[PDB]
Design a protein around this ligand. Structure first.
Ligand SMILES: O=C(O)c1ccccc1Nc1cc(Cl)c(OOO)c(Cl)c1
Lengths: 116, 117, 117, 115
């Protein structure tokens, strides 16, 4: 479970499905190289994006297409997209789960690490 | 699927709560919160299968989590004595409920989800 | 400028919550929640005028925030029956306490701001 | 009393965060971020002066609260590099924006209000 970046809808009381997500890597030129993207069908979870060999001991970024989400449900969010920036794998391979409790005009997140 | 479960995880250690005592009750017209079930937070910080289809009924419930015991063992002196999640259930039939519990020494937050038939 | 300030915010409309029922209790010697204070949240979203250091004493307290009146009168269908915040108070030094509540129809958050005046 | 306001609350100490560096950008026509305003946080955990209604105009803006240096000063090991809030401003008209951010060593949350 490298990045099981779960996203939850705090209004519909269901996982946020069909929400586009984008990943980036730390480029040496202070740029964000695109890495992966996708949309879900029924459940709002992220997986199968980065493999054990795809990681680096560096900075990352996760972008979630949030404004496009609510227009479909006819909601007009204040936020445009959400970004979490972190340093990973400093002490070796660990499994990272990124929380994301969305809401129109509000969001929250949390990080879960492992010992080995 | 699991009829309902409680999800709890520490926002300081970045790990699910381990050995955080939990309890459940039932609403009684005499205001007496008659105890119904209890449990201990495992290494995964989750308790599931507490209320079966027969055990659970359409009514008012409460979930109590022994937050203060969780911190003092870690040598941490928290603010909240415990937490409570008061709600209604099965308004129009049986459903699946999973609730969140983001513990921090001086704060917490909860969130619940419902899945349509 | 009170030792007990409760702020309630709407995480859908993005406005300070208004017309929200608030109740304050206190555990008695018989483990009884003797009523302490109550009120309704204004359009500023800050509840105040609930207690003073003359009336505020050491002990275990409880804070009640109604939710059904907030959304059902608004037309939204909530999940949580209400919000209950229970905490020790004035253990040593009557520090001013601020209680924060970020409300969503299916989720809420609580945080405490403590400071010695 | 400003159209833009940001406040950061520390959960572990339960006190308003102090000395939290902040920066504000603007959506440049070259898809860049021209720096707009920056600063740190006081003992009240709020922002004292960010943007007047004169400088505040339409467009997309980004605000970042520096947290990595925070917990190192606190002596705790963080996780997040920092927190990024990006939003569309003045899409329909003037308003007053307040940004609230609850910070914990391994988690954070945020929300906004309008006027
Ligand atoms: O009010 C919030 O949005 C909030 C969100 C998460 C955690 C705590 C919160 N409470 C809170 C936040 C702020 Cl910024 C605040 O005042 O700012 O001038 C108050 Cl009174 C209460």
């Amino acid at each position: 479970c490298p990045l099981m970046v779960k996203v939850l809808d705090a209004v519909r009381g269901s996982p946020a499905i069909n929400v586009a997500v984008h990943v980036f890597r730390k480029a040496a030129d202070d740029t964000w190289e695109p890495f992966a993207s996708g949309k879900t069908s029924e459940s709002g979870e992220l997986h199968g994006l980065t493999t054990e060999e795809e990681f680096v001991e560096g900075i990352y970024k996760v972008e979630i297409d949030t404004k496009s989400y609510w227009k479909a449900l006819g909601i007009s969010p204040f936020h445009e997209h959400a970004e979490v920036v972190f340093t990973a794998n400093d002490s070796g391979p660990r499994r990272y789960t990124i929380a994301a409790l969305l809401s129109p005009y509000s969001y929250s997140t949390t990080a879960v690490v492992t010992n080995p």
